[model samples]
Target: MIALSQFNSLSKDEAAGLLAPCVALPAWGETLVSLRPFASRHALLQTAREAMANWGEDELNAALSAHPRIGEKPTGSQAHAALSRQEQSSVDSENERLAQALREGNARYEARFGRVFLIRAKGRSGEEILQALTRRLQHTADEEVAEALAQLREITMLRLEGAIGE
Candidate 1:
């Protein structure tokens, strides 16, 4: 992990490279890079929260493209792939029934929302994830988008902490 001091000193491109794996929004990364020289880790995260709060429909859809569908294996050689696998480690893929259910639930959620089912998977059990997916499917379009964005914020912050440290 890079220290906060090192993060603060990185060049624009360098910093954005580090931030890209934390979240897929290039504009969000650029905004963070431009605001750098963060006095502390808390300050950096605070700014990240503020920046993400401004994300709109276009930004959310763009960012979701980088994340894998829940219950699916994370693929590709991208930096975020490893992080996605780790965040979803709580999911017991060996449970065929649960796996099949999640696959079906994810399909339903996507068909209804027109987006991937986004959630902060870290610390949540497979059952919990499935329950959340079921519940979220009942949300109105606007409500679901708001919930998805909130979950994205949580995932982004966690990844940022891993990417940058004291």
Candidate 2:
């Protein structure tokens, strides 16, 4: 892991590069980079949380668009693709039964929510992810939006944990 001190000291482009693989949005990365010199890793993670919580509609859509569906593998630029692959390793991507269930749930979820299903899949079991999807299906649009944004924050903090020193 890169030291939080080093992360705080990076140039704009370097800092943005460090943040991009975590969220895949240059704008988001730029904002985080601009807010550097965090007092501690906790402070850094808090900044990430606030940034995502306050994202505009366009920013949210862009980040959500870049995200792969829950059971499918992510493929994109190398950094993003690999981070996703590693983060999602806890889920049983190889189990056909679970994969098929997730596929069907994703279809229903998108139909209801008008966006791709999003969850912080790292460290969550397939059953846990599926249960979350099923439970969220009944959420109102505003509630779902809040839930998705919270999940994105969880994802950002998880990614940030590895980006900065322990």
Candidate 3:
């Protein structure tokens, strides 16, 4: 993991490349890069959290457009795609039933929520993700939107931890 000092030193394009994998929005990374020279990793991440909170609906929607549906494989040669695969690796072939359930749930979720079912799949099993999806199916539009942002925040933090290291 590169030091924050090192991150602060990189050119905008380079820094954006390093940070984009954590959250596929170049704007998010660019904003973070502009706020640089962080005192600590915590400070950096906190800034990221705050920045994420300030994202406009268009920005949030733009961010969500990058992700693939849950239980389905993400295909691309980009770093974000690779990270998606890594995060989703917990979904194995043995969980085919759960995977099928997830697919149906994803459709239902999108129909209800008008967006893909977003979740931080880092340490969660397929069953856990499925259960969470089922539970989230009951959420209202406002509730689901808030929860989606919360999940995005968690996923962003997890990706940040992996990409930038402690």
> Largest lDDT belongs to which candidate?
1
How would you encode candidate 1's per-residue C-alpha lDDT over 1-166 as one tens digit per residue? 9999998888889999999888888888899999989989999989989999887778788998857977887876768788888889999999999999999999998899888899999999899999999999999999998889889889999999999998
Against the reference, the lDDT scores of all candidates come to 0.89, 0.82, 0.81
The CA-based lDDT of model 2 is what? 0.82
Single out the weakest 10-residue window by summed lDDT for candidate 2. 52-61
How do the residues 1-166 of candidate 3 rate in per-residue lDDT, one tens digit apiece? 7877788788878888888877757777888888877788888888888888865546556778758887887788877788888888887746678878988999999888777789998877888889999999998887777878888888888888766644
> What lDDT tens digits, residue by residue, belong to model 2 across residues 1-166?
8998888888988888777778757767777788888898888777777777666546556778868887888776687787777777878978998999999999999888788888998888888999999999999988888888778777878887887883
Answer with 1 or 2, whichever has the higher TM-score.
1
Error of 1 at 149 (Å): 0.4
CA lDDT of 87 in candidate 3? 83
Using Cα atoms with residue i matched to residue i, what is each candidate's TM-score against the true structure? 0.96, 0.87, 0.89
TM-score pick, better of 1 and 3: 1
**Deviating ranges (above 4 Å) for candidate 1:** none
